[PDB]
Amino acid sequence: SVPAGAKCRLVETLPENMDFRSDHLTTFECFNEIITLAKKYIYIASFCCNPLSTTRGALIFDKLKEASEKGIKIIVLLDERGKRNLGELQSHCPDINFITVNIDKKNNVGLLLGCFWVSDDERCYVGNASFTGGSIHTIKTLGVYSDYPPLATDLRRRFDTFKAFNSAKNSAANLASAAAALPVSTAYHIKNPIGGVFFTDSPEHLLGYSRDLDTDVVIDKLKSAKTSIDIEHLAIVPTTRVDGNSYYWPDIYNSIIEAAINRGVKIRLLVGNWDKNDVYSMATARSLDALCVQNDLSVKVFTIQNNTKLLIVDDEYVHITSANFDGTHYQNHGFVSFNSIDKQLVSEAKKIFERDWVSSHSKSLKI
Amino acid sequence: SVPAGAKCRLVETLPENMDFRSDHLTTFECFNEIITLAKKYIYIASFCCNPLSTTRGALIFDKLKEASEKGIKIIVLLDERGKRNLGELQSHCPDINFITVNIDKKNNVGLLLGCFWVSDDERCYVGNASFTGGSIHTIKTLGVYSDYPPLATDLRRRFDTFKAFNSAKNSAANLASAAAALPVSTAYHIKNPIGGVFFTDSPEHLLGYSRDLDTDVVIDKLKSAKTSIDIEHLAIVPTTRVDGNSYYWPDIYNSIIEAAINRGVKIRLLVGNWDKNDVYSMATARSLDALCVQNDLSVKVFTIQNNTKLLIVDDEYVHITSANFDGTHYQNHGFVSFNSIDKQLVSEAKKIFERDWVSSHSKSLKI
Numbered sequence: 167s168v169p170a171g172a173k174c175r176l177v178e179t180l181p182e183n184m185d186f187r188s189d190h191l192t193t194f195e196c197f198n199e200i201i202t203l204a205k206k207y208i209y210i211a212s213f214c215c216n217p218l219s220t221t222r223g224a225l226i227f228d229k230l231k232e233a234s235e236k237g238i239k240i241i242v243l244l245d246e247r248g249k250r251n252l253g254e255l256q257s258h259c260p261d262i263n264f265i266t267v268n269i270d271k272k273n274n275v276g277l278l279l280g281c282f283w284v285s286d287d288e289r290c291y292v293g294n295a296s297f298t299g300g301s302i303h304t305i306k307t308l309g310v311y312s313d314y315p316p317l318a319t320d321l322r323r324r325f326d327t328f329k330a331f332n333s334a335k336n337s338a339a340n341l342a343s344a345a346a347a348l349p350v351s352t353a354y355h356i357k358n359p360i361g362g363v364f365f366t367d368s369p370e371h372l373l374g375y376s377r378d379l380d381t382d383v384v385i386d387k388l389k390s391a392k393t394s395i396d397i398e399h400l401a402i403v404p405t406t407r408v409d410g411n412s413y414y415w416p417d418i419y420n421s422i423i424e425a426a427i428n429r430g431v432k433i434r435l436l437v438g439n440w441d442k443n444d445v446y447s448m449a450t451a452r453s454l455d456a457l458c459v460q461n462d463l464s465v466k467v468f469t470i471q472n473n474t475k476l477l478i479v480d481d482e483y484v485h486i487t488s489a490n491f492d493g494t495h496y497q498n499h500g501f502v503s504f505n506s507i508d509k510q511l512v513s514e515a516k517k518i519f520e521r522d523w524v525s526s527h528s529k530s531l532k533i
Numbered sequence: 534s535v536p537a538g539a540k541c542r543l544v545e546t547l548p549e550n551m552d553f554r555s556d557h558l559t560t561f562e563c564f565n566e567i568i569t570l571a572k573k574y575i576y577i578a579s580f581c582c583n584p585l586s587t588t589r590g591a592l593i594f595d596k597l598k599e600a601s602e603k604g605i606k607i608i609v610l611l612d613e614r615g616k617r618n619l620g621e622l623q624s625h626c627p628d629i630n631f632i633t634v635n636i637d638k639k640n641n642v643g644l645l646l647g648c649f650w651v652s653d654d655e656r657c658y659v660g661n662a663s664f665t666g667g668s669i670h671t672i673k674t675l676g677v678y679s680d681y682p683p684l685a686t687d688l689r690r691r692f693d694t695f696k697a698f699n700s701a702k703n704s705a706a707n708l709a710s711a712a713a714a715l716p717v718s719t720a721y722h723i724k725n726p727i728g729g730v731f732f733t734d735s736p737e738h739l740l741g742y743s744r745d746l747d748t749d750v751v752i753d754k755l756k757s758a759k760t761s762i763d764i765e766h767l768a769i770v771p772t773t774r775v776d777g778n779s780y781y782w783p784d785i786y787n788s789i790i791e792a793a794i795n796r797g798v799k800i801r802l803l804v805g806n807w808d809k810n811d812v813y814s815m816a817t818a819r820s821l822d823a824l825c826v827q828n829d830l831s832v833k834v835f836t837i838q839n840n841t842k843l844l845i846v847d848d849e850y851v852h853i854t855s856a857n858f859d860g861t862h863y864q865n866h867g868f869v870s871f872n873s874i875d876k877q878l879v880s881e882a883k884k885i886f887e888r889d890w891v892s893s894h895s896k897s898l899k900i
């Protein structure tokens with residue numbers, strides 16, 4: 167019988183100089199566990215790789231180095247734009263396979279975030295802690311750890327898809343022939359979750375015929391919200407800038423406002439500070455402020471380094487990812503999002519949002 | 534051979550105390566022509582009927598009264614909410630058939646605007662001049678007159694649909710049986726225009742299987758705009774208030790911003806003033822203002838009484854209607870919109886927008 171919640175527990179980076187506390191497994195403890203228990207492989211994917219920037223990051227890197235010397239197959243996927251550290255990394259760990267990835271050779275916009283560890287087809291982390299010293303030690307992050315092999319194995323299948331986009335030797339990133347020669351498979355999805363858990367995926371051109379596009383799942387859940395929407399992301403601005411040209415994409419932004427105005431949903435947005443000289447973020451803040459007057463919309467801002475990407479709907483659905491709710495991300499970037507409708511796990515996430523909401527690092531939107 | 538433009542010419546109400554001038558047929562001249570030439574019927578549809586409020590309105594009413602006494606079948610459709618004047622109207626013209634209409638007995642939101650005259654299946658006016666003294670004399674309006682029978686006859690078919698919703702005697706407004714027993718037909722549409730002209734229709738539940746929903750045509754044209762978008766409407770606010778409850782509907786609002794930010798379209802919005810205490814209109818103005826900074830978006834406001842509803846895209850498409858670009862209208866109200874891609878007619882409309890844009894009644898958006 168499948169265990170409800172698929173053996174998932176929350177994982178946090180709660181830096182010493184911030185006021186957040188919890189009993190959850192820390193990112194540092196979690197990565198140490200995955201490395202300690204590994205017998206065949208450890209596969210890691212994130213945008214940047216920079217473990218040596220903090221004390222705990224370098225400790226994790228040493229344990230990983232030691233594993234690679236005992237015969238563990240260690241593969242680290244990073245985006246071709248996070249490749250500056252590469253020589254430093256390869257000199258530290260000559261037995262680890264560092265692979266740079268370009269998932270968007272057509273337009274050079276899409277980036278690999280993935281942000282997960284999987285090991286031995288039995289254990290995995292997924293969330294928003296990159297393989298950097300900051301995400302392991304000094305930056306607030308949120309993720310999920312599971313030792314349920316069916317779920318871990320499903321996450322490794324995302325690693326198979328991303329590894330195909332290696333920057334070398336015309337296979338699936340430099341050849342459209344063997345890029346269709348990779349079955350982009352998933353065992354679980356929103357129509358067939360495992361113990362209440364499933365992964366959603368991005369972008370659409372890597373989706374294949376069986377995976378769920380995270381854009382569609384997220385927007386549907388926002389539009390289904392009957393009571394409450396809690397979001398902790400870096401920004402909700404319907405505009406992003408790419409190539410020095412602004413790009414308007416209001417799909418999520420509209421879904422939130424629609425829930426508030428048309429359906430009466432209580433919404434709490436905890437988002438990052440913005441540049442007062444960025445007219446598109448000032449304008450967005452001013453509009454959010456006006457909605458706070460006449461609706462049950464509330465907005466608070468943080469200035470701490472914080473990678474948390476969390477969405478909770480109606481206390482029945484939790485979504486934790488590495489992507490930010492904006493158009494550059496949901497139209498282009500390579501990442502995998504954690505979805506669960508397990509009531510217990512959702513309650514733990516809600517307990518984390520309530521904490522962050524009243525933290526001293528969260529200040530009510532003032533305009 | 535079908536005459537290009539389908540014999541259409543613009544029609545205007547240019548009040549004496551405003552600075553607008555043109556050589557176009559006036560609403561007063563136009564209505565006098567339709568009445569003078571009528572041999573079988575005159576069918577009129579608008580929200581309110583109140584001719585006696587101005588000198589020219591009452592003159593039109595006298596000519597209409599005189600026609601009804603010579604044997605012309607005169608039918609005037611008005612919404613059940615414009616029925617206060619009815620006793621005054623029926624005492625003035627006992628031989629005119631005044632019919633009140635409720636197109637939305639299900640929810641009591643949708644209103645009849647129609648706003649057109651058709652006569653003898655040969656002549657018609659369509660635009661935003663209601664059958665009121667104000668629209669005929671003291672309020673700026675814009676419309677189209679044609680004496681091309683194929684086009685007039687197509688407009689009369691809209692009158693057939695609306696007349697079915699009479700508030701009396703369970704047929705198509707109080708019975709779902711004989712409401713499906715009315716063929717909702719059109720001869721022309723966007724896929725089959727007559728001389729470059731076609732009508733679009735609203736709302737969707739009166740649409741039948743062959744008419745175009747105005748929402749879809751308008752949004753498609755905005756999304757197709759390659760160069761320019763010129764709009765003169767009463768408001769572009771993505772929120773409207775119905776039943777003392779606000780309703781968010783950003784579809785058109787988004788299409789405009791998308792054209793400006795993503796596609797570089799030069800946009801000029803000439804809209805009505807707003808209540809400074811209406812937070813949703815203040816917020817909308819503030820956002821439009823921010824877009825004026827970084828884009829080729831320009832906004833001017835008028836305070837005159839002005840019913841003009843005009844959209845021009847790329848100097849290749851003109852759209853003149855009685856509905857305002859908002860969600861209450863495009864989801865609920867009964868109206869017919871004039872569409873033309875005739876280059877000559879579009880140039881005349883563009884000449885009118887350029888005039889209004891630099892009129893002294895048009896003041897640049899100041900926030």
Ligand SMILES: O=C(NN1C(=O)[C@@H]2[C@@H]3C=C[C@@H]([C@H]4C[C@@H]34)[C@@H]2C1=O)c1ccc(C(F)(F)F)cc1
Pocket residue numbers: 404405423427446449450451452453454456457770771772781790812813814816817820821823824
């Ligand atoms: O979203 C609204 N305004 N608004 C945009 O359209 C965005 C675009 C324009 C400026 C910035 C960014 C460039 C993108 C954003 C902004 O704040 C808004 C929503 C609801 C209401 C109402 F109060 F009516 F309910 C009014 C306004």
